[PDB]
Amino acid sequence: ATIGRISTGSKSLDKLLGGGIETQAITEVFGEFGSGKTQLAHTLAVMVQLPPEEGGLNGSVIWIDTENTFRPERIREIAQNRGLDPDEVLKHIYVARAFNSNHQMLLVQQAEDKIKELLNTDRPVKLLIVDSLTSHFRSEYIGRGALAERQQKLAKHLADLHRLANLYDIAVFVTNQVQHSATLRVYLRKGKGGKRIARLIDAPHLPEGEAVFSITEKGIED
Ligand SMILES: Nc1ncnc2c1ncn2[C@@H]1O[C@H](COP(=O)(O)OP(=O)(O)O)[C@@H](O)[C@H]1O
Ligand SMILES: [Mg+2]
Ligand code: NA
């Protein structure tokens, strides 16, 4: 029932987010290629495994990869530099590669089996990443009539994701690349000096400024 919050690594981003990404919610990060969507996903997959006084939820991670951008050595790096054992961190991340959008849909069903298994253990799943939420959908549904059909399949997939978030008290974190019904939309862009800037889109309950952070050996951080 009460909502959990997963620190991103960046104090600035966390404040913008109201303390971190929420369980019982789908948080969508969207932005151009190279903006940092996948790096934020990597960092979150580590942060969630921290205890709560360090901004985590003692959680396991399920990661649905659609573009083969998951890097286990990046996870090990981030974990090591934040004082976690990198091999242990990796063992609590369950990555599956989605071959196409239908298999991506099926993987969400399978995620429920893994979630149920871990639920009342000491490392329940607390984060479900889809990176990228839309890349297969953009690629497969194209041409006259595909707008309605793509949106319908995507809405179904997002409904499935929202049910897991709410039913199991999990944060869902999804990426979308920009040249549907997410709970919170975060616009990410690359700024001057290598900085990254985040802004919330249509989110009255949180701050209306922008967060600024860097991508480092610790993942993201101010
Ligand atoms: N270890 C690192 N330290 C600093 N910047 C990094 C590191 N690793 C990757 N990056 C930067 O992250 C950016 C890519 O982020 P990425 O999450 O893949 O973008 P997206 O998923 O939004 O296309 C690149 O600019 C790259 O230089
Ligand atoms: Mg990416
Ligand atoms: Na919490």
Q: Short summary of the structure?
A:
Helix content is 36%, strand content 27%.
Could you please describe the fold and organization of this structure?
GO terms for molecular function: ATP binding; ATP hydrolysis activity; ATP-dependent DNA damage sensor activity; damaged DNA binding. ATP binds at residues 31-38. One of its GO terms (biological process) is DNA repair. Belongs to the eukaryotic RecA-like protein family. The protein is α/β, with parallel strands linked by helices and 222 residues long. The protein has a single domain (1-222), classed as P-loop containing nucleotide triphosphate hydrolases (Rossmann fold). 36% of the residues lie in helices and 27% in strands. The chain contains 7 helices and 11 strands. The chain has helices at 11-16, 37-47, 72-81, 86-91, 101-118, 135-140, 146-168, and strands at residues 5-6, 21-22, 25-31, 60-65, 93-97, 125-131, 171-177, 184-190, 196-201, 210-216, 219-221. The strands form 2 sheets. A 9-stranded mixed beta sheet has the order 5-4-6-7-3-8-9-10-11, sandwiched between helices. The protein has a two-stranded antiparallel sheet with strand order 1-2. It is globular, with a radius of gyration of 16 Å. It starts with a strand and ends with a strand. Bound molecules: adenosine-5'-diphosphate (ADP), magnesium ion and sodium ion. Residues 37-38, 69, 131 line the site of magnesium ion (MG).
